[PDB]
Symmetry: D3
Subunit: 131 residues, 6 copies
């Protein structure tokens, strides 16, 4: 899955698109997404202008958009249980791993793991409604 | 506390500032913040261009920035346990209520409630580290 | 009239859309519009970075876009006679009241009143051509 | 007066700076300003995406910022009486002519004329307060 | 050729559109383009905030987009041999002169000359592929 | 060299900063820079909205900013001889290799090679003046 297929499946767009490409797919099982962290992104201007750090809530959004890609292969975040372990900086390559716990007809609960290299930077349990 | 005092205490800035003014303060107890939701904000262009809805993760950030105001009256989100109850639209006036559970020397855990009018739209438990 | 109906009737869009919702309608008589003033709007960065104040000309544009909503329920500002009474700040809720003086086949002249709470911040007489 | 002296005297900045250079100066008498109209300006995206036309209220702001340059050689628009004669498009070179009617200790009233080539596109009478 | 015909022929758009209008056309021979340089363009914020100078690579892009207009009257820059002679500032009117050396079925090589007034600011030889 | 040292040495800033971190340094010999290509960068909206491709001239700017880092360890692009070999897409990791040919007191000529993985995407010879 390339970038044109990302913009098609992810309902968000610039400046709120936080998926760059698709690394590994396993329909109804696991997805591994990739987002490049660049200092030329607009939110780096506004989140701590003294020193560039990626906001933790945007990592949660990146995990949510990756989960949506797994689903469509109208979802909406119903809940999030997140721990922010380590910071992400410009130049980092954020790996987004999504594992489905199990899916019902109107809801889905997933495991979210964000990594830079092999260091875990964010773990999350996300639930989605339908509208 | 006015807007010039908001930009001073909130380390974020545009386009990632999500506090407009300060409604009610109770140092080391409760804060009630206000953020205006306007269709002229940049994220509305990118989050569902078909229909404007405020991303849930940005409400979590608004609750986090309001908690930071309560604290400074270097914090960093360590965890978040959030349920997104109802959507927020352009024209809504987001009320952000923060209640401290209790604070230790190096961490803080708060209750977060986001409201439009009196309908609760987001409830959250947030924890903060120090760096 | 909701926000999706606002973007449909107002020919402007981001970052030059200055109407959030529709409070009161009286076709061919009066309209009462609402615009939320938020510090996260792009023009606040550039208009006096030392202290956030909403430019007066953007209030005139908000009154003009509200008048256009009243009309379509191709107009173009032909003239404006405005007095700027008091400033508007982030967090303010701008009320836009438009009263038609009377409409001819090719022109319209309206009364424009911008309010925060009940304090009048801007009064204007606007005329529109057709193209 | 060059562009670095423009940003110094004009309290506005990007994306609300509407003066590019200074053509002719006559302290306490007349100023002739220049603003380049380019399709790469942010407001052209949002004002009529079907066809690029410069909003009339931004011409009023350009005339106001030019008047401020004449003054400082804390002003704030108190009133504006404007007629919008003809449209301005990307590629146009907007000439801004300001003539002081006369100045008192706490207020100033000026004549504003915006031109492209020699066609008058906007005439205005502006008044300024002090704060 | 007006601005609506520019956006139609130039595949780029905001904030990467660097052609404002069309001054002189000679199909399969010469084109003379116009781009207004304004301090209100987004790249002026980021290229030397101490003093506004237009990046040289954006002049090369303006010459490339002007060459594309000459062609379509799917091209892609294959090579560029450029010398940057003198700087361009806000308020300058950039003239872009393109002369075809000769065109084959799958490639084109042109002469590019950027001028402000009659001073040459950029000379370039550009080649284009097809995809 | 980290990102805070990049913003210090590179005179450009957002939205015209095209260096994320520093991989390998050899003062007065070679530098290897890194820029993450993300679909959330502003120029991707405007360069071919149908399909995201990084403009070739921005790769030249990335090579120029990397050369400036090598130098300061007031330069200005005097000339560029570039061949654009293969496209760069969102998600790519652009490697920027700069080799000094030799430096005189008032000018510098370098070899520029941009790579994604090990595929060469851009080769360039750049010369810099001083002001």
């Amino acid at each position: 899955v390339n970038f044109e297929e990302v913009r098609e499946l992810v309902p968000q767009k610039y400046p709120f698109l936080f998926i760059d490409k698709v690394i590994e797919l396993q329909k109804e099982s696991r997805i591994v997404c990739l987002k490049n962290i660049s200092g030329n992104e607009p939110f780096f201007a506004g989140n701590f202008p003294d020193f560039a750090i990626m906001p933790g809530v945007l990592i949660v959004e990146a995990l949510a958009q990756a989960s949506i890609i797994l689903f469509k292969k109208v979802f909406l975040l119903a809940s999030a249980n997140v721990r922010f372990s380590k910071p992400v900086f410009p130049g980092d390559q954020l790996i987004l791993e999504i594992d489905i716990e199990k899916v019902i007809s109107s809801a889905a609960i997933v495991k979210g793991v964000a990594k830079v290299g092999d260091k875990v930077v964010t773990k999350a349990t996300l639930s989605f409604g339908v509208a």
